[model samples]
Target chain A: MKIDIHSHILPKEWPDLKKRFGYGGWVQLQHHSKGEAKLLKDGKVFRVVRENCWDPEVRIREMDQKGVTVQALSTVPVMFSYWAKPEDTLNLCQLLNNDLASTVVSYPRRFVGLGTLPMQAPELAVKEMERCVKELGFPGVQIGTHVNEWDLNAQELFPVYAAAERLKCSLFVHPWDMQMDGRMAKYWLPWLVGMPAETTIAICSMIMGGVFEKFPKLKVCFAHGGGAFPFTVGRISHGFSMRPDLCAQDNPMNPKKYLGSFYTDALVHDPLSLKLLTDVIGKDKVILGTDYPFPLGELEPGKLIESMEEFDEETKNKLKAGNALAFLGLERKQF
Target chain B: MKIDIHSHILPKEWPDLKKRFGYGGWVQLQHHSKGEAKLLKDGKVFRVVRENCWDPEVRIREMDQKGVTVQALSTVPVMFSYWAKPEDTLNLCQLLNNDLASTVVSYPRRFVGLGTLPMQAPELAVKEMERCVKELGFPGVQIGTHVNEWDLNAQELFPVYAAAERLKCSLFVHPWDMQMDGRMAKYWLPWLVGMPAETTIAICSMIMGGVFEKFPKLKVCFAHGGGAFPFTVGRISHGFSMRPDLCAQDNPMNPKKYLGSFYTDALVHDPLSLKLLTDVIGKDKVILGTDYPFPLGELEPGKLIESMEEFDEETKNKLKAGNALAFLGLERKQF
Candidate 1:
């Protein structure tokens, strides 16, 4: 029984905000005569989506085929809207947040939820974060690596981190605008090269920026094996010692000593990668996080684990579900 | 016998380049009354160097203590000088190349040489690469992941890689000028975090940009165990199939299909990491590399290979010596 922690959902029908927001970045969904819909950003098609994108029924059917017993759904990353006016993005998130909570509520046994925040405005971000965990009963919130241009370690975001710790909710840092520099803008280097770099920045920002030492108890999980951070831990540790001028001025903590302090998903896509990730940051900290309902995800979510000769059935089960339950602070009964 | 393939060396003296180059990036070495000397870049202190950094006798003595029988001598990565003016940097490189070549000559059995190139000018880079192999009798040339700001696959660089292939000389891609955009200013993230990412960019650019396919015979080795590229191979392969829009447009080959098309160092600090890199790239391509004379390198040199219980005598022997000899086209009897 696997609980996938990184599945995504977009509502089958949402208002076309291009007209309401009256801005270039507003996202709109244009329905096609065929089963797919074209998701447009600023009147340009961003991606083509199918029923599995938003329809929970279709989601459940696909989940069954993939051997995923449960999926934790959040809005697609494109919906982050950090670039928009805070209030405008909040209104949109509230709608999507409620939609996500209800879907989890409807399929209590087969689904869970993580919600969105208006991270561009920390006040609104904290407010919605509280409501998501307290009122809507979400276990967590999903935020981009940065808000507008501010990285996750920005001082304004500290309250959100403190709030997450006080409320016992996890924070999932996913990537968008990975190649915001717009260089290497072609051939998916952005996704391949940029996404990992972005996540590394987020992790390094938090660690070196003193977020972990400052907050102490905040529960944080990173998508895509915490970017490239875990694999480069040795280099980071070495850097901390060799160039105190560069690494130590931020936070004096030994980088390696901070291992297992945060969680990362096993969306690394290779059995060897998963094995190494488990070794780097205690296997207990790894859980399922397939970027589902999209082509960029593992087609059979738990199949990688199932195929690995290194993992026995019990360890595989823990990676697929047990660790996720611990990460979300939930029990088996919750699913 | 053990071989330290990633060891670095420098000349005991140099003509002051500020006068000749007429530009400021030229470096000067100031010998201290103590055991160390200060390397000055543009008249500012760059790094404090010890005798082992320059003296061939000291390098040989350190190698004997570490059980490293042969050291593949390359200039420290900082000497790459890829961003300087073409002729100016080429002149500097020629000086370093001859210095490295002569140092190897002084201890012919204990040291082999990989020379420097003026990568800012491809014509000069190719000319020097040819000379390094044919005239200097060096086995290969060491380069940074980027030339000034251009990636290794930038159109101007193809000829250099092709030249490397034609000469049958290996290429050693190291990382420098890390910490772009000042995000990683503290915590030495440039070395810890940025170095690995830079290597990954070089590998991605070479592989996805089809340099490996175009020059199939080119021998290349990535420092720091190919950085984060091996761990993310699963992600890279998955992304390749997941996004035809962003991937394989330039090469159309599965990223995984190119495994072992290059060589990587065993400098990753984790045993699991070394094992995984071996598995990903094949043991034949996992060579011994100790960032010698640097504090960040393996302290005991090949001790990691010695201590890895999972690998038997043959595998460990291959990693510690054979793979490097093969990568550089050196005979085992040379040591």
Candidate 2:
């Protein structure tokens, strides 16, 4: 019954497809391509390895070790919408989504797929969401917190939210590049600090911009345990209630209710963070997410549940699997 | 018994003192300052109506409205420490500290003081801290999180922490300017986003550098609700635990325990922030703070209590006043 709702895996099908589409050129221009393309075996770089990131077999072994029976895999974030042209980005999305769907089908019991979309072009993104959910059988779609520097609330992206809502698919929002400004340059503050701030900005914008009111049924899961959103929700609500001009009346939605509807992942893996998120959003709105393979993601996801003393077995089960299953519409397996 | 331990009030004595010391030249260089002199009414430029940043009558009236009995005032930040000679900075610290003491004496029941230090010079900063605690009867000293670009853990500042511990005086750590690289110029992100990130850096540096082990009894209060510390503590600890090289097994202190010892102000004024802070550090470690005179700090302090459904009455009492009183060791007459 355990499900890891947030996990990432790079498809084996990417290199040739990327080379054909001139994605190798884009990868070189992007920051991630700087290191050796060679993969490592036991922390040492090796020529025989196939993948640049973690190996897929190692991922399954680690998942089994952690007792994660089902892991939802998505493409590596190299497919982020900011760096690609709209047409090429759409093609990449189809290629990545199709690859992910095929992986899920091959191991239906162990894996589920969340499709990617070409969010740089909102109409194309919505159409892709339709294709992934209706034709390809994805339960949800994954997106970065920002489209370039613009937040999810940008008027152009409202249609994507509407499309997700119409198709009853959850949206998995992840952090792309950290938003670096002057303050972050001196101390590598962008990696240490900007990542969380970007997550906070995305969640706040979505809540404040009335996205929740327009599509109440569309479930949204924020990575890194809702970034810094859960911790600041009370202050946000208080600020919203007090400032009718800025948030309450400016948007055509009840701010408190809209805030209450979000489902957050438990990726941050701090007991205090978990308790605070559960307290603010409640247990039902929280689920398990591990930003897998990345060192920053929870290395041992199952230990997170075992280490918690505040929540009992029932609450732990809900946080670990029940909520995620319901969000991804996998209840039929258990029911 | 409601008190704000993290409130700011610009002393009326500063203007004349600045002009007298030729420190008025420093004011012209500030981002907020225009030409030689300008005034703000609610953050907008206007005629010079108020003589100084702290208008006590205005503060008292607002405090009355918000049901706050007392607020601990400090000097206006970045004003006293910009590019001065050691001797001059030392003299300026005396003037600012003496003026702050006089204000508290005048409003003994409604005011307590957190004094300034001569931070540009390490020896002078320690000397000022000693004088502020021993001579002026101040409870603690306030220093910016970073000295220009150097953090509190820089070898130059260890003496200050030692002196604070010896004096049993609390240290109120606040952020100065957020100076990132040139990228921050596009949006006001450097100031808004950079400030919080700097606070996180300062605190984390202190934690990792064994500053807590050096002075376990040192009482530190982090402004802006410990910046991003509470939400990121788990991730930091998790990262530290996994990497023996990065964490260094020889280190004796636990990040979680050291994290729990410090106090945080609720100035960020979000209930979720407060809840997250409490969740991470526990309710007893949190105290009421209002940045005051700044728009972001102009929240009703009492409303923070009324809005917390997550906290029980006992925990609420401790967070609102009790913890701050104990940390500062203030007398009952101060309230």
RMSD of 1: 2.4
Q: Weakest 10 consecutive residues, lDDT, candidate 2 chain A?
A: A27-36
TM-score of chain A of 1: 0.96
Clashing pairs in 1: A187-B246, A246-B186, A246-B187, A246-B188, A247-B187, A247-B188
What is candidate 1's local distance difference test score? 0.84
For each candidate, the alpha-carbon lDDT, in order, equals: 0.84, 0.70
Question: Can you give the lDDT of residue A317 in candidate 1?
Answer: 84
For model 1, what is the alpha-carbon lDDT of residue A263? 89
Q: Candidate 1, residues A11-57: lDDT per residue as tens digits? A: 77888686667776777777886678988887678888898888899
Instruction: Kindly give the number of clashing pairs for every candidate.
Output: 6, 13
Q: TM-score, each model?
A: 0.94, 0.79
The best candidate by TM-score is 1
What ranges in model 1 sit over 4 Å off?
A16-19, A180-183, B13-19, B42-44
What digit string (tens of lDDT, one per residue) describes model 2 on residues B58-156? 777777877888888876665556366678778777877888898877787887889988776888888888898888988998888877646666677
- Worst lDDT run of 10 residues, candidate 1 chain A, spans A178-187
